[PDB]
Amino acid sequence: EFNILLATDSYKVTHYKQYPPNTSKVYSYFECREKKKYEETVFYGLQYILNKYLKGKVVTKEKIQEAKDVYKEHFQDDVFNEKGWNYILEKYDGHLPIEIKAVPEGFVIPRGNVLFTVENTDPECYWLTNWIETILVQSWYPITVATNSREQKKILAKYLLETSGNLDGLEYKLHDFGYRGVSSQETAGIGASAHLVNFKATDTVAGLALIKKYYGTKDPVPGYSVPAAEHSTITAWGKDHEKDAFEHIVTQFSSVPVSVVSDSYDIYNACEKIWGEDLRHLIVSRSTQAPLIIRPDSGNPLDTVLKVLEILGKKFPVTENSKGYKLLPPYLRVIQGDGVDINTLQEIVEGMKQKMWSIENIAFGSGGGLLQKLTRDLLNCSFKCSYVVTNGLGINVFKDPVADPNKRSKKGRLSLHRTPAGNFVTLEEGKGDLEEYGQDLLHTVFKNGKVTKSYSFDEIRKNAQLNIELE
Amino acid sequence: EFNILLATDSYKVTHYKQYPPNTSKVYSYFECREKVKYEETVFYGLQYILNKYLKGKVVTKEKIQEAKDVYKEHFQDDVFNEKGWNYILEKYDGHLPIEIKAVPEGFVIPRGNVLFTVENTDPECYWLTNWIETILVQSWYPITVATNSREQKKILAKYLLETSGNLDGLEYKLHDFGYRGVSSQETAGIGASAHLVNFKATDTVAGLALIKKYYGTKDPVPGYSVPAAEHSTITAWGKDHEKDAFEHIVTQFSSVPVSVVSDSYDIYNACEKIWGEDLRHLIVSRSTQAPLIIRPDSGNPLDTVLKVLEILGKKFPVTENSKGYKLLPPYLRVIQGDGVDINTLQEIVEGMKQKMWSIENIAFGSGGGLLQKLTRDLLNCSFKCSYVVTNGLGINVFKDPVADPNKRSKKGRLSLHRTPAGNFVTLEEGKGDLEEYGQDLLHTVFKNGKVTKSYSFDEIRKNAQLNIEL
């Protein structure tokens, strides 16, 4: 079972001995620090952490003794704050005397703004605020995935609109294939849920269970998939029977959309000769609601996409849409699910536009690129102490390393506000109290062991909408 | 609760309908596919996956109905194989009819070799082999962490040996600070455990519990830490009181080693004036077993390390060791815990060598670089089908994409062997049965819901040692 006393960085165990004596309050904040592009971030994921790990009775006699035993060996010394944890157990029935205030989930906030703050609600628990830094800071991951997914949605929307005149199907143009490429089952659920903030296309099922348990949607599920082959379901038929495999699978799934990986031996032969001649009759008869979706999976992603399109365009009846771009017949589409990250996504749609192919023809699958190839320094997600009270006097505190101005942290009590032009500003030094900038956008979401405000996944999606979607 | 019927890629739900009719066997393997870096990998972490997710009764009526209801909405259609999963429930009491063979954990094997194989033990369950690809393939992460961690140990060993004449303290020279920088609690435990295959220094507490539960050590714990400050324990004292913070912390931890972050405002001032002058008397009185470990945390990592060392070497009594390199007194050390990954680690130690500083002086902390900035394509970890039986006839199967030879997979029944020169070779096409290469080095580790062979964390560590350690 999860033990909050064993869910921190080891050195934090020793910090209760290092703060200034007579310190009654430690107040800390999280930002995605600005760096001298990712100019705005989606706040998403805190609610999951609050519910799974921080709420309710998280301290027990047994958990205290377990931690004491572990730390005695780990440190080869007794340095553990057994008294402090006992106090929380006795006074608060093991609920954390902590208050967390946060921007609403799904909100899209420029870099360098406070997104949440943390403080102890009992003077004895000054040490507790930063104890939970480690667990709260992991919110960087759903924030970063949601943000990066949204940034790719902006690219897709831009090119789709330019090449087609609309945004139909935008929410299915980036399909999560990342389940096998992430570091764990838990990460898979979290990351998949973050992508779903922006899109509805996914193969990472763990996402759906997380959303149902922690957020909830009006619809039965937040995300969807369609039948698709993998290489094993093609190669199992034998090298000489790729066509038999193709035929069997599109016939099995004749009335729904079906993706068929086509590069097992020779992607270009498969498109030109197998799909384009041998089995053409099984493709052109298909419904508009059930296209064949041809899937290349190797080679340079842009070059292979263009070559596949060029091949298919000469074997199938292509039209020119009202924008002047080429469109495959409705029963035939393509998905590129290899080598896709935000960078190659951009290169591919731009290459397509250059060769006069509509973005309507294509969708993208991304796995590692989407859910794994991201770190905490992408958005400089960071948690810092900005305010303490020592001997009954509050002091504004911060770091400001001489060699790196980018690492300077904010000072004092913080609040988030709308600017007169409708943007965001973070007020420092408790200046929000002057009430010159309207209401604080942070809300209490956790206080003394209870989750005090929650958002549905539907609200989060609404908050995270693109401007182009609003317009 | 965890539901293995909901722990696969969506499309695999539809694959039982896509295999050739009358397929009775699907056999698949995992390798770190070959492409000058990462020529060999540490096999680690499958044991965790077998135990936490695959073993025992993993199928119930409840789980089957839950999967049915989710998939009906997820596909907007009924395509889920209720019957196949019920068959497993009713025939095998929900235990998976699967056999898995694997190289021993901790083993170091060149790229391009079979590391584990998977096959169904019941003909009705031909579809099960690749259903669990997704979960098994996540072994890439502990493999990749362990491997990249060990490569860093190699660098440290080489430089420590050259600048000091020995390897004392090697296993404490790379310290896991990645708890906050990974994507989840589960990842934290897995990744930290993997680092611990090579080192004993960690702040990622989650790793200890995983190791204790799934592997085991003779010693009470696999990894250790020491007291250390963070910016909040310095800055809370106020900008004008950095000295008071330093003095309090080192006095509180006077007889154990203590790391103190010294760059909150001005690292060079803190080293030269606060540590080097105002508080010097509190440092030079410390035990060899309880050094002050000064921690810079910003600026160019190499440049800052060198300047910190130059500063300290002028304020403190420096010796020259037997190899001719400079050594801080034993009560004073440095840890660089910012911007450290395998590339910058190499750059720092090489730069220290050029300025004649022993690697004895320093340790490194790595977080994101150690546990998060890694992907499945670093070692090309990959799971593929190589052998099927259909209509009673065994077929050797494979992919071979025209535009990418590096993605070609292996054919047929596989086995792993020692060569006459004592290296590893993977035999394809069932050629291991010809018995020209001696015994298959893979062992059966899972069969029909039971874990059938396992390794302690002490043995895994022994298997993973460096040559120079041997």
Side-chain angles (χ1 to χ4, degrees), chain A residues 1-35 37-470, chain B residues 1-35 37-470:
Chain A
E1 188 180 340
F2 183 83
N3 189 341
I4 197 71
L5 283 73
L6 290 174
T8 193
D9 300 289
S10 302
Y11 73 144
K12 289 171 173 299
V13 173
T14 76
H15 292 166
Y16 73 106
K17 290 197 171 163
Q18 308 178 22
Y19 284 109
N22 307 290
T23 295
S24 55
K25 183 181 288 299
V26 175
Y27 171 106
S28 301
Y29 78 101
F30 178 99
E31 64 175 320
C32 293
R33 200 173 59 243
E34 225 178 346
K35 172 77 66 62
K37 256 177 168 51
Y38 299 100
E39 294 182 355
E40 51 187 14
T41 70
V42 187
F43 185 68
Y44 169 72
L46 180 55
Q47 182 163 308
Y48 168 79
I49 302 171
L50 298 180
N51 279 282
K52 186 178 185 68
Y53 296 122
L54 302 185
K55 85 177 175 180
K57 180 173 185 171
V58 295
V59 184
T60 66
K61 252 204 310 180
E62 292 80 10
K63 281 176 179 180
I64 293 166
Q65 184 57 48
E66 183 192 23
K68 183 181 182 178
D69 291 344
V70 172
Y71 288 137
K72 181 180 183 52
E73 304 300 336
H74 184 49
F75 285 108
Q76 298 289 301
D77 195 31
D78 296 325
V79 295
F80 175 70
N81 192 7
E82 184 181 9
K83 293 184 65 173
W85 284 106
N86 271 340
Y87 177 73
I88 292 172
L89 181 59
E90 296 174 349
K91 182 81 160 268
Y92 296 97
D93 192 32
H95 290 58
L96 304 180
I98 282 288
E99 178 169 32
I100 298 175
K101 291 178 181 166
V103 67
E105 293 202 18
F107 264 46
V108 175
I109 309 296
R111 297 284 283 281
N113 282 295
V114 57
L115 305 177
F116 66 86
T117 59
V118 182
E119 60 198 306
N120 57 307
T121 65
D122 182 317
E124 289 300 310
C125 305
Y126 67 96
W127 54 267
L128 183 59
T129 299
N130 275 37
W131 186 280
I132 59 185
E133 163 173 16
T134 313
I135 207 162
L136 291 176
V137 163
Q138 295 189 328
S139 71
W140 78 261
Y141 176 65
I143 290 169
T144 301
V145 176
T147 297
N148 185 70
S149 172
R150 187 173 181 272
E151 286 305 309
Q152 293 172 89
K153 198 180 175 180
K154 287 189 192 164
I155 294 160
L156 291 167
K158 174 180 182 300
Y159 285 80
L160 190 56
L161 190 65
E162 187 152 11
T163 62
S164 95
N166 64 77
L167 296 179
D168 294 357
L170 177 59
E171 71 276 17
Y172 295 93
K173 290 280 177 208
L174 190 53
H175 191 130
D176 178 344
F177 286 169
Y179 207 163
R180 84 191 61 173
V182 295
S183 42
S184 70
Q185 289 299 308
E186 187 184 10
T187 284
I190 295 170
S193 75
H195 171 67
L196 288 169
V197 170
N198 312 110
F199 293 91
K200 296 179 170 240
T202 184
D203 262 50
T204 308
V205 193
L208 318 194
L210 192 148
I211 288 170
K212 184 169 186 169
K213 183 165 188 160
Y214 298 97
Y215 291 91
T217 51
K218 169 183 165 53
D219 294 343
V221 293
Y224 303 94
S225 196
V226 300
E230 65 181 31
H231 287 105
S232 82
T233 56
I234 306 302
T235 59
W237 292 73
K239 165 58 178 291
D240 299 322
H241 295 276
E242 185 174 30
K243 181 186 76 78
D244 289 336
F246 283 3
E247 177 169 15
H248 174 80
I249 290 165
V250 297
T251 298
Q252 285 303 293
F253 302 98
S254 59
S255 295
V256 297
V258 60
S259 172
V260 184
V261 68
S262 293
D263 78 325
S264 290
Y265 319 105
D266 187 323
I267 177 63
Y268 312 114
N269 175 74
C271 288
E272 189 166 285
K273 176 181 183 299
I274 312 180
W275 291 128
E277 300 177 4
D278 299 345
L279 299 182
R280 192 179 189 285
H281 63 287
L282 303 186
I283 302 322
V284 293
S285 56
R286 291 180 71 96
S287 158
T288 295
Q289 289 69 52
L292 168 64
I293 311 167
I294 294 175
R295 176 181 163 227
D297 191 48
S298 51
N300 182 281
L302 173 56
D303 295 336
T304 304
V305 160
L306 297 177
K307 188 153 170 177
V308 164
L309 287 168
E310 171 196 21
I311 288 170
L312 298 179
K314 277 163 168 22
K315 301 310 255 176
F316 290 89
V318 186
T319 62
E320 183 185 300
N321 73 15
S322 57
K323 297 304 169 178
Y325 293 83
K326 304 194 296 301
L327 188 57
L328 291 172
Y331 48 74
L332 183 57
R333 292 287 184 263
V334 170
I335 181 165
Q336 171 59 239
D338 176 72
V340 181
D341 57 21
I342 182 166
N343 295 131
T344 60
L345 180 76
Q346 163 76 33
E347 289 175 3
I348 295 170
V349 299
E350 169 67 22
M352 282 179 66
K353 174 196 172 178
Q354 293 272 54
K355 297 295 186 170
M356 302 307 298
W357 284 103
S358 177
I359 305 312
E360 294 165 281
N361 294 290
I362 196 152
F364 299 85
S366 182
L370 191 72
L371 307 192
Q372 180 65 32
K373 200 172 68 173
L374 307 164
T375 68
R376 191 168 66 93
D377 14 84
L378 185 53
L379 310 176
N380 306 119
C381 301
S382 190
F383 179 106
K384 292 292 165 289
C385 177
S386 69
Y387 183 72
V388 313
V389 170
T390 300
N391 291 305
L393 294 169
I395 72 165
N396 303 334
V397 296
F398 66 100
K399 60 186 283 197
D400 183 28
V402 71
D404 193 355
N406 288 319
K407 285 191 171 180
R408 178 181 62 86
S409 65
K410 300 185 186 291
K411 297 175 184 181
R413 301 166 49 247
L414 307 182
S415 60
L416 186 62
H417 307 261
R418 287 292 189 168
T419 65
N423 303 121
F424 296 85
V425 56
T426 296
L427 296 182
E428 298 176 46
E429 302 172 13
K431 285 182 166 64
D433 296 341
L434 298 184
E435 297 166 324
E436 297 179 352
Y437 269 98
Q439 219 179 33
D440 191 353
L441 300 181
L442 309 171
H443 301 276
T444 300
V445 289
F446 181 100
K447 188 175 186 182
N448 306 323
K450 316 280 190 172
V451 174
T452 55
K453 195 190 186 59
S454 296
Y455 303 85
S456 70
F457 203 70
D458 297 321
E459 301 179 58
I460 291 167
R461 284 175 159 179
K462 188 206 67 177
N463 286 333
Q465 294 177 278
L466 295 188
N467 294 333
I468 191 185
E469 292 182 304
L470 302 172
Chain B
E1 192 185 339
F2 178 87
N3 187 347
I4 194 189
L5 282 68
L6 288 175
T8 192
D9 298 297
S10 297
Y11 70 150
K12 290 167 171 299
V13 178
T14 71
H15 292 168
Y16 70 106
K17 281 170 170 188
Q18 303 178 30
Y19 289 111
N22 307 316
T23 294
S24 58
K25 153 115 56 184
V26 172
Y27 170 103
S28 300
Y29 80 101
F30 177 102
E31 62 167 328
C32 290
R33 204 171 54 243
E34 189 170 2
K35 278 281 192 173
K37 193 75 174 185
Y38 308 115
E39 292 191 322
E40 54 187 27
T41 71
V42 182
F43 185 67
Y44 168 75
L46 178 60
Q47 188 165 305
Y48 167 84
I49 298 168
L50 299 183
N51 280 283
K52 179 181 188 63
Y53 293 129
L54 298 188
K55 85 171 174 190
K57 179 163 192 165
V58 301
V59 185
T60 66
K61 294 178 303 179
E62 284 71 22
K63 289 182 178 177
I64 298 182
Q65 186 65 49
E66 180 186 33
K68 189 185 177 188
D69 291 337
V70 177
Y71 288 132
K72 177 163 186 53
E73 302 301 318
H74 184 57
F75 287 108
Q76 291 277 292
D77 192 23
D78 236 281
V79 59
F80 170 66
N81 188 14
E82 183 182 10
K83 286 177 176 182
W85 280 111
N86 259 90
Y87 176 86
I88 292 168
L89 178 54
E90 296 177 354
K91 179 66 177 302
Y92 295 103
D93 191 38
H95 289 51
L96 297 180
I98 278 294
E99 179 167 8
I100 298 176
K101 293 179 165 160
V103 308
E105 309 233 344
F107 259 40
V108 182
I109 319 280
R111 302 272 289 278
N113 286 290
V114 60
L115 302 180
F116 66 87
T117 60
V118 185
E119 70 177 321
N120 58 298
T121 71
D122 188 319
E124 296 292 330
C125 300
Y126 63 92
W127 56 268
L128 180 57
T129 299
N130 277 42
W131 182 285
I132 60 173
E133 163 178 9
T134 312
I135 58 105
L136 286 177
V137 156
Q138 291 187 348
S139 72
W140 78 264
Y141 173 71
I143 290 167
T144 305
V145 177
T147 298
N148 182 64
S149 178
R150 182 169 181 277
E151 283 304 308
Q152 282 171 99
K153 195 178 173 179
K154 278 183 188 172
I155 300 165
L156 286 157
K158 167 187 183 301
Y159 281 83
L160 184 62
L161 187 60
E162 186 171 8
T163 63
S164 91
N166 66 76
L167 298 182
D168 298 347
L170 176 56
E171 57 291 327
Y172 295 93
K173 288 300 200 186
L174 185 55
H175 192 130
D176 176 347
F177 291 155
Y179 206 161
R180 78 191 65 178
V182 295
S183 46
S184 69
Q185 292 292 316
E186 194 186 2
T187 289
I190 301 165
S193 80
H195 173 63
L196 287 165
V197 172
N198 311 114
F199 295 93
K200 293 177 158 192
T202 192
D203 260 46
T204 309
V205 180
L208 309 196
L210 185 155
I211 287 172
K212 190 160 81 173
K213 176 169 180 169
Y214 294 98
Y215 288 103
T217 52
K218 178 172 168 54
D219 299 333
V221 298
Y224 307 93
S225 188
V226 302
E230 63 174 32
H231 288 97
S232 77
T233 58
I234 307 302
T235 57
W237 293 73
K239 43 213 163 186
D240 291 339
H241 292 274
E242 198 182 17
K243 178 185 83 72
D244 295 322
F246 285 2
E247 171 162 10
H248 173 85
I249 296 173
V250 296
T251 305
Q252 290 292 294
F253 299 106
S254 54
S255 65
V256 296
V258 62
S259 158
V260 180
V261 63
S262 294
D263 78 323
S264 294
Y265 313 114
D266 186 332
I267 180 71
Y268 313 111
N269 181 64
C271 287
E272 195 163 277
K273 294 192 190 173
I274 311 187
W275 294 128
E277 294 177 10
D278 306 331
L279 299 186
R280 192 183 185 273
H281 62 280
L282 300 183
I283 303 311
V284 295
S285 48
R286 297 177 68 91
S287 152
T288 294
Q289 275 69 55
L292 171 64
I293 305 146
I294 283 170
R295 181 183 154 225
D297 195 52
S298 51
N300 182 281
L302 170 59
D303 295 338
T304 302
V305 162
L306 294 177
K307 191 164 164 172
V308 160
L309 291 173
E310 289 300 327
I311 291 171
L312 294 176
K314 279 169 167 45
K315 290 309 214 182
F316 289 95
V318 172
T319 62
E320 189 182 270
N321 71 19
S322 58
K323 295 305 189 207
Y325 290 84
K326 299 194 288 280
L327 186 55
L328 294 172
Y331 50 73
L332 187 63
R333 291 296 183 253
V334 169
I335 183 182
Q336 170 67 37
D338 177 70
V340 180
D341 58 25
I342 183 161
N343 296 318
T344 62
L345 174 67
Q346 166 67 50
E347 291 174 4
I348 301 158
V349 292
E350 167 62 25
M352 287 177 67
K353 181 186 170 188
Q354 289 191 26
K355 292 297 182 178
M356 306 295 309
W357 288 99
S358 176
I359 303 307
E360 294 167 280
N361 292 295
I362 199 156
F364 296 88
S366 182
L370 185 73
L371 301 195
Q372 181 63 31
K373 197 178 54 175
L374 299 171
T375 65
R376 200 166 62 88
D377 63 10
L378 189 62
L379 306 173
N380 297 130
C381 305
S382 190
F383 188 98
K384 291 296 172 276
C385 180
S386 61
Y387 182 72
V388 299
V389 181
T390 304
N391 298 306
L393 271 49
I395 314 287
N396 297 338
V397 306
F398 64 97
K399 60 185 284 194
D400 189 25
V402 70
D404 193 5
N406 290 313
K407 282 189 164 182
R408 177 176 62 81
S409 59
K410 298 174 194 301
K411 305 176 190 185
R413 289 205 148 264
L414 307 179
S415 56
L416 186 74
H417 310 264
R418 287 298 183 168
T419 60
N423 296 314
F424 296 95
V425 59
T426 287
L427 294 188
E428 302 175 48
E429 297 184 56
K431 276 182 167 63
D433 293 339
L434 300 185
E435 209 78 355
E436 301 183 333
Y437 270 93
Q439 295 295 284
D440 183 14
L441 308 173
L442 270 37
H443 301 264
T444 291
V445 295
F446 183 97
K447 183 173 187 180
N448 296 327
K450 301 185 186 172
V451 177
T452 56
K453 190 162 199 303
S454 64
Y455 307 88
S456 78
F457 202 72
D458 298 320
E459 297 311 309
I460 285 170
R461 280 179 158 169
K462 287 192 174 183
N463 291 327
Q465 296 184 279
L466 302 189
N467 293 321
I468 189 64
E469 290 179 307
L470 299 169

